[PDB]
Amino acid sequence: KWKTVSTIFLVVVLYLIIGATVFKALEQPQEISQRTTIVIQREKFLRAHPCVSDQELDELIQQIVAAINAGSHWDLGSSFFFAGTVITTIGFGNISPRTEGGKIFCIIYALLGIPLFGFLLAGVGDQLGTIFGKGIAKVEDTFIKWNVSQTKIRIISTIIFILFGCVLFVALPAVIFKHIEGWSALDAIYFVVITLTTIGFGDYVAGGSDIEYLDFYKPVVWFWILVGLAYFAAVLSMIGDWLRVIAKKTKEAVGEFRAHAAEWTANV
Amino acid sequence: SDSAINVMKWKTVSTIFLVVVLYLIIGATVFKALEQPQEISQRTTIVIQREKFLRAHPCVSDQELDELIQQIVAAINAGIIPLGASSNQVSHWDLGSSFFFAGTVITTIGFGNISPRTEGGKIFCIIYALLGIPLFGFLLAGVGDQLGTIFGKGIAKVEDTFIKWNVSQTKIRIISTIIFILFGCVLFVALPAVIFKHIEGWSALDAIYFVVITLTTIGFGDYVAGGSDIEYLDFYKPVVWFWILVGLAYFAAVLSMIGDWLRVIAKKTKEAVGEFRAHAAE
Ligand SMILES: CCCCCCCCCC
Ligand SMILES: CCCCCCCCCC
Numbered sequence: 330k331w332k333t334v335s336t337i338f339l340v341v342v343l344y345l346i347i348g349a350t351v352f353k354a355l356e357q358p359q360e361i362s363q364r365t366t367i368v369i370q371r372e373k374f375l376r377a378h379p380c381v382s383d384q385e386l387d388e389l390i391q392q393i394v395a396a397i398n399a400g401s402h403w404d405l406g407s408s409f410f411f412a413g414t415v416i417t418t419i420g421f422g423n424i425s426p427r428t429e430g431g432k433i434f435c436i437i438y439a440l441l442g443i444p445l446f447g448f449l450l451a452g453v454g455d456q457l458g459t460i461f462g463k464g465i466a467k468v469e470d471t472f473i474k475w476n477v478s479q480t481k482i483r484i485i486s487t488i489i490f491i492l493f494g495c496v497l498f499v500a501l502p503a504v505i506f507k508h509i510e511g512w513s514a515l516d517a518i519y520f521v522v523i524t525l526t527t528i529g530f531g532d533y534v535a536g537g538s539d540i541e542y543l544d545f546y547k548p549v550v551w552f553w554i555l556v557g558l559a560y561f562a563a564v565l566s567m568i569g570d571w572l573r574v575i576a577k578k579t580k581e582a583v584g585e586f587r588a589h590a591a592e593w594t595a596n597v
Numbered sequence: 598s599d600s601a602i603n604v605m606k607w608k609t610v611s612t613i614f615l616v617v618v619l620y621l622i623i624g625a626t627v628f629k630a631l632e633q634p635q636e637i638s639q640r641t642t643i644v645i646q647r648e649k650f651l652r653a654h655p656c657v658s659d660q661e662l663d664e665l666i667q668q669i670v671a672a673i674n675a676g677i678i679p680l681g682a683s684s685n686q687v688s689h690w691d692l693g694s695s696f697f698f699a700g701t702v703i704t705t706i707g708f709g710n711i712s713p714r715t716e717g718g719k720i721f722c723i724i725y726a727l728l729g730i731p732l733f734g735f736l737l738a739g740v741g742d743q744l745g746t747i748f749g750k751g752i753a754k755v756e757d758t759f760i761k762w763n764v765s766q767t768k769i770r771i772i773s774t775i776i777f778i779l780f781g782c783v784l785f786v787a788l789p790a791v792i793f794k795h796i797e798g799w800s801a802l803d804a805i806y807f808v809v810i811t812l813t814t815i816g817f818g819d820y821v822a823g824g825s826d827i828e829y830l831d832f833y834k835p836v837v838w839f840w841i842l843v844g845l846a847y848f849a850a851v852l853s854m855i856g857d858w859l860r861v862i863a864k865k866t867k868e869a870v871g872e873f874r875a876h877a878a879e
């Protein structure tokens with residue numbers, strides 16, 4: 330009978346409004362400057378080049394906009410990488426089907442692909458989930474039977490998972506992307522988190538930005554994605570579980586606050 | 598006994614892993630076979646337009662000309678209106694557009710049509726998704742539970758009406774699953790896609806292609822219901838993310854059903870291979 334959805338809905342709508350205000354506060358400033366720095370650039374080109382005028386430039390800019398539709402791509406290895414983004418749902422979009430057929434196939438390819446991949450990822454996670462189990466198996470004896478009791482060890486263990494997991498699937502792959510791909514420390518981490526969360530803006534793509542890389546680099550990447558996605562899968566789930574606790578902790582802390590405020594009121 | 602099943606599990610993953618490689622391989626061939634041809638006609642016709650400009654303007658920055666385009670495309674990664682006229686640009690990070698941005702973040706769609714360029718917006722976006730995505734999962738879960746019972750009530754009315762003599766519980770379930778996909782593809786695919794056709798000016802395929810890519814949490818960003826400037830009554834964009842909310846809940850089950858069907862065929866093909874193994878002309 331009880332809905333319980335509206336409350337979570339509003340928290341989400343609230344979580345969005347807070348986000349919106351923070352993003353425009355952070356991004357719109359640099360927007361304006363770049364939007365001014367772009368105006369300075371057009372006039373510079375027309376002034377520095379009597380060869381070009383208002384008429385020629387408008388025509389040029391319009392064709393480069395048409396180039397935005399496309400930008401060799403769709404090669405033997407790119408389309409394979411494309412299909413990867415589809416079944417995983419990341420969908421960087423940097424390369425997408427421009428053919429009515431490539432779209433219909435993409436539609437069919439996704440409806441069938443996504444469910445398929447889930448089975449693989451489901452097994453990949455299950456497999457690594459037990460691998461982690463073996464690792465923490467010897468960790469639950471050495472310094473567990475010793476001083477600290479069992480109820481509080483469950484925290485030390487979870488910290489080892491995130492700490493260690495963030496190194497293998499976040500730190501190391503970001504460090505490699507930094508050198509090989511030429512990205513910064515934040516951009517690398519930014520890419521990893523955006524990629525392994527299946528968001529995939531497409532602003533940063535390890536396969537893209539090509540003047541430098543080898544066919545050994547790109548396979549290990551998609552495998553990284555395969556394995557890393559399972560990591561955030563549990564990480565995202567745990568973070569989701571932490572919220573469930575805080576949701577009940579706050580729900581009983583609010584019950585505490587009236588129970589004592591009611592007490593307090595009845596004194597006269 | 599404990600390790601015996603582990604041995605049996607890895608055997609399943611590996612086979613599925615190899616099936617995934619084939620599916621991608623078969624996909625890569627189908628895409629590059631479809632897309633690369635038109636990529637060539639454009640890749641060559643773009644050199645023609647440069648030739649119609651390079652030689653048409655010898656006084657141009659011929660070697661430096663490509664440096665200009667680089668800055669344009671470098672600006673193309675962000676919303677740009679760099680023309681002689683329309684020097685008054687529109688903000689992609691205004692009060693309303695960033696809200697839509699956060700909606701794409703917590704739902705993992707990530708159209709990428711607008712992404713943060715600030716070290717803060719990035720360090721915020723990361724923290725925002727780590728906590729946001731799980732949060733949205735609860736919403737979509739309840740939204741599914743809620744809409745799932747709205748179907749339970751309506752399915753009860755239709756199942757008893759079709760109740761006749763010699764009704765078979767096992768075979769009646771099929772009738773219900775069809776009507777689910779029927780109204781589902783109407784309310785969340787057909788209807789909202791037709792509206793996008795007229796409001797967004799998108800073609801027939803571009804609408805359904807958009808609905809699918811969006812509600813399958815892929816979101817290439819090639820098409821977005823709130824990307825352009827056209828008029829956007831602002832009674833349109835709000836209904837968009839809502840549809841996304843419930844539409845996501847829909848494909849959540851649709852995609853989940855397909856996986857079920859795939860796992861049925863996975864058995865039937867696995868035993869059909871055992872039959873052909875067995876007999877194959879005695
Ligand atoms: C970041 C958004 C946090 C909003 C908390 C709302 C709490 C409502 C009391 C149940
Ligand atoms: C280059 C340093 C990037 C640090 C990102 C970590 C943000 C905190 C996430 C909780």
Ligand SMILES: CCCCCCCCCC
Nearest residue numbers: 340572575576577579728
């Ligand atoms: C740091 C913001 C975490 C938001 C917690 C949400 C509280 C749930 C209230 C029901």
Ligand SMILES: CCCCCCCCCC
Nearest residue numbers: 616619620623866867870
């Ligand atoms: C893309 C999958 C083509 C069909 C493969 C059938 C299963 C192979 C194992 C027998």
Ligand SMILES: CCCCCCCCCC
Nearest residue numbers: 616859862863864866867
């Ligand atoms: C186009 C048919 C797709 C069905 C694939 C069957 C996979 C069987 C794996 C055992």
Ligand SMILES: [K+]
Nearest residue numbers: 422531709818
């Ligand atoms: K893009």
Ligand SMILES: [K+]
Nearest residue numbers: 418527705814
């Ligand atoms: K996703």
Ligand SMILES: [K+]
Nearest residue numbers: 526527705730
């Ligand atoms: K996800």
Ligand SMILES: [K+]
Nearest residue numbers: 420529707816
């Ligand atoms: K995306």
Ligand SMILES: [K+]
Nearest residue numbers: 419528706815
């Ligand atoms: K995505």
Ligand SMILES: [K+]
Nearest residue numbers: 421422530817
């Ligand atoms: K994208």
